[PDB]
Each structure stands twice: as structure tokens, then as C-alpha cells.
Design a protein around this ligand. Sequence first.
Ligand SMILES: CC(C)C[C@H](CC(=O)O)C(=O)N[C@H]1Cc2cn(c3ccccc23)CCCCCCNC1=O
Ligand SMILES: [Ca+2]
Ligand SMILES: [Ca+2]
Ligand SMILES: [Zn+2]
Ligand SMILES: [Zn+2]
Length: 166
Amino acid sequence: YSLFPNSPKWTSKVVTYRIVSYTRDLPHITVDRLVSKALNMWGKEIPLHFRKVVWGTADIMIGFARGAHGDSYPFDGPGNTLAHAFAPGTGLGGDAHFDEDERWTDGSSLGINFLYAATHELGHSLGMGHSSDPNAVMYPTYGNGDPQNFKLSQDDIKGIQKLYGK
Ligand SMILES: CC(C)C[C@H](CC(=O)O)C(=O)N[C@H]1Cc2cn(c3ccccc23)CCCCCCNC1=O
Ligand SMILES: [Ca+2]
Ligand SMILES: [Ca+2]
Ligand SMILES: [Zn+2]
Ligand SMILES: [Zn+2]
């Protein structure tokens, strides 16, 4: 595992999150259930706790976007970069954006598995950098293992606990 330079991390017991926009590929309830599932995958290993808010600012802002969307990291259409997220901090810090040009799926169709992608991006939102281990969720590319049958590897778990303790 690797952390971001200077090891930024949320310095609070509770971290809020808000899903600002949705994809047209999935029911809204599925995105909510899956973001929750994803946050709690990391949540179970550490002392942090998460709370969803539906208006205003939250530490982690989640949204879907195609192309340019204000943050200077324009998406690029289907394929290539699937999504991106930012190290803990204020403003853009902690946010996770998913490329709406991708065919997102919960796993029952051909496309990009949103739970797998969200676990990876929220790992970045919590402070995780990339892994050299092809099997870790934090590995830089999608599809080495099985998007529909996976779990955090010992490498992912070691890194998150190095950042927030057990
Ligand atoms: C892990 C994931 C959920 C989030 C990451 C983004 C991130 O690290 O947060 C991601 O999108 N990685 C690219 C990395 C990537 C692979 N290639 C690329 C070609 C161009 C640009 C990027 C890539 C080769 C071609 C395949 C393109 C489709 C799959 N893309 C990827 O795996
Ligand atoms: Ca933020
Ligand atoms: Ca893309
Ligand atoms: Zn963005
Ligand atoms: Zn990444």
C-alpha cells in the first residue's frame, strides 16, 4: 500500500458524505446502498464512522460527471479513466467523481462495477494511495481479480489501519 504525500487523513471520529448527483444507469437507491456498502468495507477496519447528509457541505462529496465539471480533471468519455477522488482535506479534498460516460452496473449486467469502483475511490477519499499488489483493491487498474467477488486485501487493510489505527 502507499499513502498520499504527508499522510493526510480525516482528523475526526465521524466523516460526513453527500451524494450530490446520480448516474442514469442505476436506480438511485442502488447507488446509495452501494456507496454505503463501499464506505463500510473500509469502515469495518478502523475507528471512523460515516454519516450521510442530503444538503449543504459534507467532508466527502460524491457525484457523477461527463467531461469538464469544474475541478480541472475533465473526464474523457467511455473507458480510460473511470473515476477520480482526492486526498482528505477541505474543498475538493475527499471528493469522489465518477465518469458518467461509463456504463455503470451493480454486477448484474456488462459494464463497470460501481461497488468495486466506489471502494477504490473512497479508499482515496480516506487517504489511500495506490498499491503495487495486483490483487489489492487500491491497485491502479480495473479488472485484475473479479469485480463481482472481492474484498479488501491484507495490503489494503494494512494501509488503512496504518492511517487510522485498528
Ligand atoms: C481502478 C479504477 C476503478 C479507477 C482508476 C482511477 C483511479 O485510480 O482512481 C481507473 O480508472 N483506472 C484506469 C487505468 C487505465 C488503464 N488503461 C488506461 C488507459 C488510459 C487511461 C487510464 C487507464 C488501459 C485501458 C483500460 C481502460 C479502462 C479501465 N481503466 C482503468 O483501470
Ligand atoms: Ca470535500
Ligand atoms: Ca472515462
Ligand atoms: Zn472531477
Ligand atoms: Zn486510484
